[PDB]
Amino acid sequence: AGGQWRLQQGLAANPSGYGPLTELPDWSFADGRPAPPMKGQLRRKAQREKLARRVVLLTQEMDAGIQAWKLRQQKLQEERKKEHD
Amino acid sequence: IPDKVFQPKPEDHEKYGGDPQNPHKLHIVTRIRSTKRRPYWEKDTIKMLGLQKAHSPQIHKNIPSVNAKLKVVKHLIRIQPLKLPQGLPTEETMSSTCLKSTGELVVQWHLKPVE
Amino acid sequence: RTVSFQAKESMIRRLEVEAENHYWLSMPYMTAEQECGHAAERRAQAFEAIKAAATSKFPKHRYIADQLDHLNISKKWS
Amino acid sequence: HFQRQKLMAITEYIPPKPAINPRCLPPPPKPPKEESVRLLRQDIVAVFRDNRMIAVCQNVALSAEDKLLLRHQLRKHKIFIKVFPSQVLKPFLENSKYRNLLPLFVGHNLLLVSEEPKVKEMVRVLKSVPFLPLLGGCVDDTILSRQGLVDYAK
RNA sequence: AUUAAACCUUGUACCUUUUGCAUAAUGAACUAACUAGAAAACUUCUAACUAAAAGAAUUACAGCUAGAAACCCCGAAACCAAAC
RNA sequence: UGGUGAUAGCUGGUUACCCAAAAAUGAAUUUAAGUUCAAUUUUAAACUUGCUAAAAAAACAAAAUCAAAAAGUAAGUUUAGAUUAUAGCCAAAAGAGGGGCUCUUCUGGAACGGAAAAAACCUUUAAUAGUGAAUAAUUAACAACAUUAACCAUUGUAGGCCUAAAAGCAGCCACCAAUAAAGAAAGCGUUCAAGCUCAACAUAAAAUCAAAAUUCCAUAAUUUA
RNA sequence: CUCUUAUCUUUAAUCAGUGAAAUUGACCUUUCAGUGAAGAGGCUGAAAUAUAAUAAUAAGACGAGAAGACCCUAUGGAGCUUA
Numbered sequence: 042a043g044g045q046w047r048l049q050q051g052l053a054a055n056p057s058g059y060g061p062l063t064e065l066p067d068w069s070f071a072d073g074r075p076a077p078p079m080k081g082q083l084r085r086k087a088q089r090e091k092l093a094r095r096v097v098l099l100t101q102e103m104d105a106g107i108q109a110w111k112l113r114q115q116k117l118q119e120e121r122k123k124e125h126d
Numbered sequence: 127i128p129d130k131v132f133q134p135k136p137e138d139h140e141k142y143g144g145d146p147q148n149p150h151k152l153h154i155v156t157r158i159r160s161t162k163r164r165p166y167w168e169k170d171t172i173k174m175l176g177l178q179k180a181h182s183p184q185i186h187k188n189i190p191s192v193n194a195k196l197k198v199v200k201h202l203i204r205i206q207p208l209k210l211p212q213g214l215p216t217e218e219t220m221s222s223t224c225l226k227s228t229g230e231l232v233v234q235w236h237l238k239p240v241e
Numbered sequence: 242r243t244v245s246f247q248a249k250e251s252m253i254r255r256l257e258v259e260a261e262n263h264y265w266l267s268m269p270y271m272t273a274e275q276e277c278g279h280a281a282e283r284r285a286q287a288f289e290a291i292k293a294a295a296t297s298k299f300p301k302h303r304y305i306a307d308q309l310d311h312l313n314i315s316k317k318w319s
Numbered sequence: 320h321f322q323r324q325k326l327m328a329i330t331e332y333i334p335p336k337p338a339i340n341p342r343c344l345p346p347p348p349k350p351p352k353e354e355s356v357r358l359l360r361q362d363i364v365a366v367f368r369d370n371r372m373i374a375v376c377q378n379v380a381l382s383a384e385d386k387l388l389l390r391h392q393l394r395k396h397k398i399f400i401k402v403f404p405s406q407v408l409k410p411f412l413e414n415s416k417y418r419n420l421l422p423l424f425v426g427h428n429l430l431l432v433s434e435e436p437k438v439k440e441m442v443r444v445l446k447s448v449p450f451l452p453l454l455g456g457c458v459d460d461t462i463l464s465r466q467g468l469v470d471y472a473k
Numbered sequence: 474a475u476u477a478a479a480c481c482u483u484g485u486a487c488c489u490u491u492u493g494c495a496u497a498a499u500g501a502a503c504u505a506a507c508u509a510g511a512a513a514a515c516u517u518c519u520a521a522c523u524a525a526a527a528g529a530a531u532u533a534c535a536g537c538u539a540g541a542a543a544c545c546c547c548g549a550a551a552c553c554a555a556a557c
Numbered sequence: 558u559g560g561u562g563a564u565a566g567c568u569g570g571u572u573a574c575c576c577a578a579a580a581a582u583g584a585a586u587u588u589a590a591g592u593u594c595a596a597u598u599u600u601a602a603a604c605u606u607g608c609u610a611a612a613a614a615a616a617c618a619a620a621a622u623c624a625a626a627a628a629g630u631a632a633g634u635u636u637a638g639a640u641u642a643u644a645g646c647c648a649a650a651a652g653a654g655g656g657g658c659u660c661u662u663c664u665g666g667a668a669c670g671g672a673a674a675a676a677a678c679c680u681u682u683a684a685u686a687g688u689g690a691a692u693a694a695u696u697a698a699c700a701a702c703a704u705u706a707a708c709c710a711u712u713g714u715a716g717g718c719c720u721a722a723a724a725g726c727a728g729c730c731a732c733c734a735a736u737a738a739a740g741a742a743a744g745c746g747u748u749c750a751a752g753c754u755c756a757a758c759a760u761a762a763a764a765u766c767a768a769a770a771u772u773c774c775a776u777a778a779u780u781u782a
Numbered sequence: 783c784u785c786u787u788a789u790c791u792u793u794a795a796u797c798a799g800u801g802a803a804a805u806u807g808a809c810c811u812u813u814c815a816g817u818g819a820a821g822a823g824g825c826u827g828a829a830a831u832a833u834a835a836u837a838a839u840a841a842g843a844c845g846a847g848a849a850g851a852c853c854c855u856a857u858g859g860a861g862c863u864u865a
């Protein structure tokens with residue numbers, strides 16, 4: 042319940058989704074030594090990193106997909122204007 | 127399907143707040159229904175798109191081939207335009223990326239409440 | 242079987258969501274001409290890797306250590 | 320199927336609601352009046368203009384045949400029984416020489432229209448029917464009582 | 474499950490067979506023992522040796538030699554011979 | 558008694574565990590409880606495109622068949638060996654006979670949730686522990702008003718028609734007048750007519766459909782956002 | 783028979799001795815309505831309900847049943863006979 046309101050505020054609809062409560066470590070050593078990263082957090086972290094690399098690669102490919110069109114138009118444009126002798 | 131469905135009107139632009147120029151590049155799609163009891167062509171399209179698990183975010187290009195494939199499964203997916211307020215992430219910030227429900231992919235996650 | 246009030250509302254909400262999908266499909270960023278051949282190079286490379294993996298079947302080797310190591314089964318206190 | 324029935328219910332036509340019901344509406348304008356009835360105006364206008372003094376007496380449950388006989392009887396008195404439907408009589412004052420004689424012509428009443436001051440003949444008409452009540456006589460188109468009619472008639 | 478054996482909550486016996494369904498239909502008082510898949514002509518695999526292989530009879534233009542790998546039970550109406 | 562463990566395409570039964578893969582099309586058959594052929598599947602080998610999609614386009618008549626480039630994606634073709642399978646069920650579409658049914662063709666299904674119990678309808682990607690969380694389908698649902706209400710009915714003429722007679726009113730006519738208002742008559746009455754009203758005139762006032770035989774069968778309930 | 787009654791004997795019931803058979807998945811073995819294949823002690827929804835015993839009757843469930851009864855077919859078989 043309450044997912045719609047949470048979305049309105051920009052937060053995750055499910056409190057168990059993306060948030061500091063879930064993401065942050067749940068404990069630490071009494072001596073103050075940092076706790077090891079959570080296996081679930083690491084697994085979730087890996088997927089986000091993989092998606093980020095894909096997103097960058099796609100945009101790079103997309104940039105060429107449109108930019109190349111301009112380079113093929115320049116080839117077409119220059120081809121039209123031709124002369125010799 | 128007639129193209130008129132995908133021909134926007136001035137009111138539609140205001141309702142969705144999308145400018146007819148500078149069209150968005152990347153689509154966000156999530157499966158919201160089961161393919162059981164559906165025809166084989168519907169089943170095949172979902173498998174091809176990779177939306178085997180429901181409520182799973184996927185990165186796709188806003189290109190005619192992808193657009194055509196999405197149209198076939200339009201009723202089974204939710205389409206949200208990807209926004210980059212801070213731009214594309216760098217190699218250093220590749221590990222700090224996070225996609226919000228609003229549709230904006232931040233390149234830096236500071237673990238600070240938006241409040 | 243008269244339709245419950247909740248049922249009517251739920252379908253209407255889903256219909257609106259599908260309408261939003263239509264609008265975001267109404268602005269194709271790339272035209273057909275630009276799309277052609279933009280990713281052909283990447284697709285070819287992926288197929289080559291697929292072929293190599295598929296044709297990697299072959300019988301396995303046999304090693305002397307396997308037969309010789311079996312003699313360790315008789316190890317005991319001195 | 321049930322699922323198809325769900326689609327029909329949602330597609331049901333929705334009627335808009337008027338702000339105010341026709342009965343409870345604010346006062347709206349109305350079309351201008353039209354005189355249909357116009358013929359009867361000419362007939363009454365002629366008889367009243369011709370006859371200065373009119374003796375107004377309530378009509379008892381008389382018969383149509385008697386009125387013709389009484390009409391001939393007045394011809395001996397030099398008076399005419401010219402009558403018409405009274406629902407057009409009230410608008411007579413609206414379009415006629417006078418506008419102020421409406422109270423005299425109230426209800427259904429016999430009208431004795433005479434152009435000459437022959438008092439004796441008018442009095443004789445009164446003597447014809449005692450039970451029939453004479454409201455009065457507008458001598459010279461001036462409102463007067465039955466008793467006043469006799470007094471001025473003298 | 475529970476502090477608590479019964480109460481409250483959940484749950485349409487079994488085998489076979491019918492349609493991939495039984496509120497059908499068969500079979501079962503229960504206990505113990507007994508009670509139903511068996512063959513190598515050729516192939517793959519494991520090795521020997523090799524233009525040769527096999528301790529005689531066989532095959533051979535890489536073959537040949539050895540090993541391993543396989544196919545149930547109970548139950549008719551009957552038919553015939555010889556005695557009684 | 559022996560042949561004899563006769564035979565039986567028939568009936569019944571046929572004893573441990575785990576992982577993987579796995580479907581009642583076409584042709585013939587004393588054939589439809591089986592078997593062969595095609596097709597599938599399958600093992601090995603050879604080496605490279607395949608599946609979805611796919612513009613213009615012809616073909617047809619005036620969204621599939623065909624398949625440039627793509628794109629999404631990872632299998633595919635050929636050679637060699639080899640079997641198994643070869644009876645559905647129900648829902649929902651399109652046809653064809655009947656005119657509910659009888660068929661042919663296409664699509665989907667096999668909850669531990671829901672529609673009352675519910676193989677066939679809806680929501681549902683596998684299965685793991687937890688005294689977590691967000692959601693999906695989801696037995697119920699809130700009579701019809703937009704011309705018609707008071708009063709009166711005089712006269713020609715019982716107008717001509719076989720009608721004895723039919724006078725508004727048996728038939729039959731055409732279809733005028735006076736009057737303020739009279740239908741040469743609208744329903745009644747009719748030995749025939751006298752005679753009952755409706756229309757006449759005067760006086761009234763209005764204004765597009767809904768929510769059979771054992772014993773009833775949850776209980777109830779109209780408003781705190 | 784109208785129109786049944788009375789008595790005796792057998793059975794019956796009590797005591798003591800001896801002591802089977804068909805049958806049997808397990809049963810902590812209810813009513814109504816629904817559902818279903820004509821169909822419910824065991825499902826759905828209502829209802830009823832100290833435990834255990836004891837004694838009586840055979841109408842219905844178109845009761846359960848068999849290779850019972852009757853008639854006819856087969857371009858079915860098989861057996862038999864021929865002129």
Ligand code: FES
Pocket residue numbers: 342343344
């Ligand atoms: S509120 Fe009824 S007429 Fe105005």
